[PDB]
Amino acid sequence: MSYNYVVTAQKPTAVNGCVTGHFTSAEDLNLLIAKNTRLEIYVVTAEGLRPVKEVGMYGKIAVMELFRPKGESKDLLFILTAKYNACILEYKQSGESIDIITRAHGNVQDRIGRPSETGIIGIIDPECRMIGLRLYDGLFKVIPLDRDNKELKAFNIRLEELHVIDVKFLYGCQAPTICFVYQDPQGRHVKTYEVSLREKEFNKGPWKQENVEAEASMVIAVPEPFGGAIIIGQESITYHNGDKYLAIAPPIIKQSTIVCHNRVDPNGSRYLLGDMEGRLFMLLLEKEEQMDGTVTLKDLRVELLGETSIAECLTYLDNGVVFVGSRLGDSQLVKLNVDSNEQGSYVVAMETFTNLGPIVDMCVVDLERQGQGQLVTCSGAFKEGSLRIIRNGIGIHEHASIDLPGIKGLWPLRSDPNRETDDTLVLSFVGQTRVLMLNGEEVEETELMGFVDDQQTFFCGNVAHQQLIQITSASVRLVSQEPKALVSEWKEPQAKNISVASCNSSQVVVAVGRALYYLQIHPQELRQISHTEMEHEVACLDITPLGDSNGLSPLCAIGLWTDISARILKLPSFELLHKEMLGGEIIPRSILMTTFESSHYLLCALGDGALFYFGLNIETGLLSDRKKVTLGTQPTVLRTFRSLSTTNVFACSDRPTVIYSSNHKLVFSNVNLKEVNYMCPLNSDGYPDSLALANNSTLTIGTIDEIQKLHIRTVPLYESPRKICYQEVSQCFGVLSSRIEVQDTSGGTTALRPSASTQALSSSVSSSKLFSSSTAPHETSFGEEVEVHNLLIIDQHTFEVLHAHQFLQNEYALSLVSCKLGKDPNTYFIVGTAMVYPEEAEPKQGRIVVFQYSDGKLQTVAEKEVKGAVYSMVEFNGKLLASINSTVRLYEWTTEKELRTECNHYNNIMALYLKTKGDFILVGDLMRSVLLLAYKPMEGNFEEIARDFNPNWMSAVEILDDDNFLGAENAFNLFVCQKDSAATTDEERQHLQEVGLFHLGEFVNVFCHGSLVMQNLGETSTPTQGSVLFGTVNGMIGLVTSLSESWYNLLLDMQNRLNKVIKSVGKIEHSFWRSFHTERKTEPATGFIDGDLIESFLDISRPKMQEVVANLQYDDGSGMKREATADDLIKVVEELTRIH
Amino acid sequence: PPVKRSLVYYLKNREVRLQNETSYSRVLHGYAAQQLPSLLKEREFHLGTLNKVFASQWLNHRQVVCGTKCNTLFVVDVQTSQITKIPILKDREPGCGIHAIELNPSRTLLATGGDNPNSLAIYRLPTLDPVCVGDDGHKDWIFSIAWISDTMAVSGSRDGSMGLWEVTDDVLTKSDARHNVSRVPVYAHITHKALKDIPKEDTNPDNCKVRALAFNNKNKELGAVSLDGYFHLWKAENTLSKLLSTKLPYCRENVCLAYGSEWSVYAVGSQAHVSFLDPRQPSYNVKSVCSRERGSGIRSVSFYEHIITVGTGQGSLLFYDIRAQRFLEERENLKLTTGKGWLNHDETWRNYFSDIDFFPNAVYTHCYDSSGTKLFVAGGPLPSGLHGNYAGLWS
């Protein structure tokens, strides 16, 4: 039996629901976004949405609603997951620590019952007497909201109407009253009933059922004074409340189906209506005061606001700002204007939230030649299409680059005394110094008066009294900001060259040979107070300020040239408080004191690429909690920077990394840059919150992006992407995409919108006549939409669109692979295309076209006609393996650069995906799951060994190892096939065995061999075997690896113990979430280790960590069981983030 | 704007699920339905000493329920190749075998024959827990079962009667509540709502036995095959009432009925030919296709998209292509064959069939899974005087 490890590298990004209300405080408006298993809390402000906390839930969110029981100061948040896990959450904050506390929880799953065909729907009574849930057809679950109902048990009340599309509680009723829209064979009707919790029965509501539009689906609960409910269909909207009936049919909504809604005003006067077409509508309620003192609806009005991304849920903020939650594309925060734009829209986007989903394809390439690999995924469709670059690490956006080789250090200066932002940058060089002027986005060489240009600068920066300090090999120079002139100079009493320096607002420390001098900074004067002598010469020293001090630090950290160690000295006397041995082969190059979230830490880097970090106690000058991480083989330099309103550290090396704090714990993540030697913070007017990164040959100027474990960069296409591959030789990615053009009366076509295929720097059109023999029956029709495919070439470093090649009319590109062919070291773009017409169920003719990108142009190399559509292509040991309809064919690469078939396999229905490892081929079928083929180079043909007999509509395939083959099910479960070497019969030998059942909660759309973090590249030092990344419809990216028997048993006991102790948001039992889940049956998970369970420990705040670890036995990998501490689960998580 | 039926558009839309249309499912399944039958491999199971298997239905992705001549109900776990038996339920009073099994449209209630062949037994899915006591509505053995709704089921008999059983909202609510609350299941007592006979036509009124039933979910019709050579169509949308009758081209061995939902055609087996019936056509306008297995009889029939699967007494399964109007050819009609299974050389065999040591295992039941790629086949020896069983999963 094989065992596998499954971990999520990038959390789901698609939005599945969103609500507005008073969640974090009684006065502020809050916006809550549910992204499958992730709940994100945002505060509504005039400027936008401010995230406060994010928690991972053990389940897929289907219902999320706010409610306020009597006696509560703020609304409570209820979630019902697709795994029947119910929970009530409340926002709690203490000082700087933010977390979500579960008020109640429990599972409501039944052993028998048909899950509802309309999906999971849940509602909360306005008076908070009960929560109504629709999980099964014909059954309505009620959860009483008693204050002592710790377990959210639900009871089933029989409803006569089995199939209900939407349900809401009515406002203004004395008894709990539910209104719902249900579909009968005679059309859709709306009925209401009262809920009796003691009788477990439904009674006739305040008004009788009324016939409504056959497309009626969405129900809006209408708060008082209005009360009642609004029913939304395809063409009309109808309002029901007691004796009142009102209906309107706006033509502006007839072209799109409304899928979601949200309250705009607290009194229910306005609501948002969203749709699948991205048309945002405003629903307005006209009020009429009644003679009995009540208020009822007078009329309905709907206005078109404009176009947005596809809306899955809407949430109103304030001041006319609308949040558009998107499941199939990026979510948008947009503002409603009074005046329309040139397109007639009133909606202008202010901010965009990245969504990787739907992920259609992806590939991993080592474009930086570092051995890690960069994953680029195709996401979205039509105007929302884009490329997403995902890497383990923190990304930075490059805006400028200057040819400044040989930089030995960087420091910002404020030469203008009237500005708080940076306006000057100092470059240190051996034997000389240079200064760059900062003018907005532009950077130019200049000279700053008072500074030494003929000596190497070791440290400089801003100091108190409106002065700048520069320390060079020859002397210490104090230069005022105005008139930018030297005011005071200090010289070494030993007449020796300074080798190290550091400065802060009032303290200066200089290292010359073994001597350390402490100087005070005074207005227009430097003063020497004291000095000491070290046993060995100092290689690095730092007095960077910590915490909230005014640029002051009582301690100085140093490193030495001889004993390879770090020391803490107390100023001014330089008293030694702590000595820590670093070890390694090369002396320390930089030592740094920094602060993370007001917590003090010390870091020191060696010239051999090793990084040592420890907790720093300033009051005592002692180090603790020592940990070591290896970054690379080149010297590493440590410097602190301030960005994004927080303080962090950048480690410059051949594998640069950013040190940052998340959930009050340090996380070490790489950077998506080729290499950096030295750096400094930038806070200029044009570069606020930016970094200056100096590499071996050039200086890179740029800005830090959102700090997350996995960074995502977006390259919009404005057209539908299809497939992606990497061409190593040309340093480019190939992408298949398509745009929609409308055919005119002239016979030509016009694009509806510009896209990457039309905005490329250069382009070409295929001249082949292979498909000219046949045309569409509507080839000359007018007004018909025509889909045009193109191959886009994007640079691996800038990801800009370099070239676009257009394919022939009616030619669809189904697959794309780029690899080395035959014995030719050059990698080529291989595109599988087919001739497709609407009347042809299955293409009978297609071709494989090989392109080479060189010298800025994409040139077609060769084309090979094939008997059928090409669905997939993979690199197989330098050969081109392609799937053509029902047959898999292996093509050899000839000296003429043309493909020739060598062997094939016919025992398939339709091979949609191909991935290979070693000599094994894994083929994904349209309906027959995956099959195991093996290639025999000595025979020159394929032999079928076994195939999976568990039917599944595959979306992609990949091989974990020679024996372990990975697939995904349409039921949100993962599976791994193993060759049954123990089989004795033909039935057993031909059947791939399942080695476990694991419920992921996500639908995997693509598989790809590789990793987002440093790969083993065939080495066996990695504790896991194999590395396959996978993408999902919701933008989730995970890693699957194989486990040995020992790892599986060790981690399985860990998982079973963690399932009962870890208190995640909602306090949902983890063992149920991961249990194998289908519409027919649920089974306990086996054969897989859930890495998300351990990593979820990083989301819970410290107050919960103590309760989770208490009475928990944790295995650190030695096999010994000991009681866990908070740092044990955090430490393992830090290691886990380095394997995926 | 032309209609797009190509699977290429399906593949590119499925990757994004951006309002992907369901109209492509017909082509997806039909394309595979033509190529799948020739690529299937045989997986035979050992059923032990069970008499025969006459009926089977898919209950899960891993298990198929099977009924037997000895009234034993069991499920074959095709994923693990294991046999699990289900307890046989008794009637309300202590007053053959299981010839038919059917699942309700909701896949929550399993209807099989009980300990007494004249009684219907109800089992809960997926747990297999008992639901109701065996009824006594019929005066003779039940040969056919069909679920007309989520709560209603109709069962036929040798005397030509069809019992109408209905579960009310209160009965179903209490039954479900008991099974989910109490770990130990509790069955309810039931009786038939009404009993109606098939119409008496100018054909043999005595051979009025209803051997097969099939329900059309789209038009809410209950079709019935009698052995008098006539097909009967009843309405079963809310109450049981006769609609129409048509004449079959053959009046011998009309033991199996299936309905093609994509073609609106009723398939009726016979001694050699499969009849294609259309309620909208004259009673004489019935087409027949010969299975080529003359003299052995057609024992089962089912629709997989536009491909009709026909089981015969020789233990083989034939595939008929409606669109091509011909039988599928092997990559020479393409056909699957059953294995040896288990044959009981008992006293009855010794008395009547002692001159033959082995008989082919006739295909009495077969069913496709939800994906359409797994075909479960089960049966036993063709002769009524012999005991023996076969089952296997083709994939």
From Swiss-Prot, chain A:
Main location: cytoplasm
SUPFAM superfamilies cross-referenced by the UniProt entry: WD40 repeat-like
Crosslink position(s): Glycyl lysine isopeptide (Lys-Gly) (interchain with G-Cter in SUMO2): 1121
Pathway(s): Protein modification; protein ubiquitination
Record keyword DNA-binding present: yes
Subcellular localization(s) per the UniProt record: Cytoplasm; Nucleus
Protein name in the entry: DNA damage-binding protein 1
Swiss-Prot record, chain B:
Keyword check for rRNA-binding: no
WD repeats: 42-83, 84-130, 131-197, 198-241, 242-286, 287-321
Description of how the protein assembles with itself and partners: Component of the DCX(DCAF12) E3 ubiquitin ligase complex, at least composed of CUL4 (CUL4A or CUL4B), DDB1, DCAF12 and RBX1.
SUPFAM superfamilies: WD40 repeat-like
Tissue specificity note: Highly expressed in lung cancer tissues and some cancer cell lines. Restricted expression in normal testis.
Gene Ontology CC terms: centrosome; Cul4-RING E3 ubiquitin ligase complex; cytoplasm; cytosol; nucleus
Protein name, entry field: DDB1- and CUL4-associated factor 12
Signal sequence residues: none
Function: Substrate-recognition component of a DCX (DDB1-CUL4-X-box) E3 ubiquitin-protein ligase complex of the DesCEND (destruction via C-end degrons) pathway, which recognizes a C-degron located at the extreme C terminus of target proteins, leading to their ubiquitination and degradation. The C-degron recognized by the DesCEND pathway is usually a motif of less than ten residues and can be present in full-length proteins, truncated proteins or proteolytically cleaved forms.
Main location class: cytoplasm
UniProt family annotation: Belongs to the WD repeat DCAF12 family.
Entry keyword Cytoplasm: yes
Pathway assigned to this chain's UniProt record: Protein modification; protein ubiquitination
Annotated compartments: Cytoplasm; Cytoplasm, Cytoskeleton, Microtubule organizing center, Centrosome; Nucleus
Sample GO molecular function, one term: ubiquitin-like ligase-substrate adaptor activity
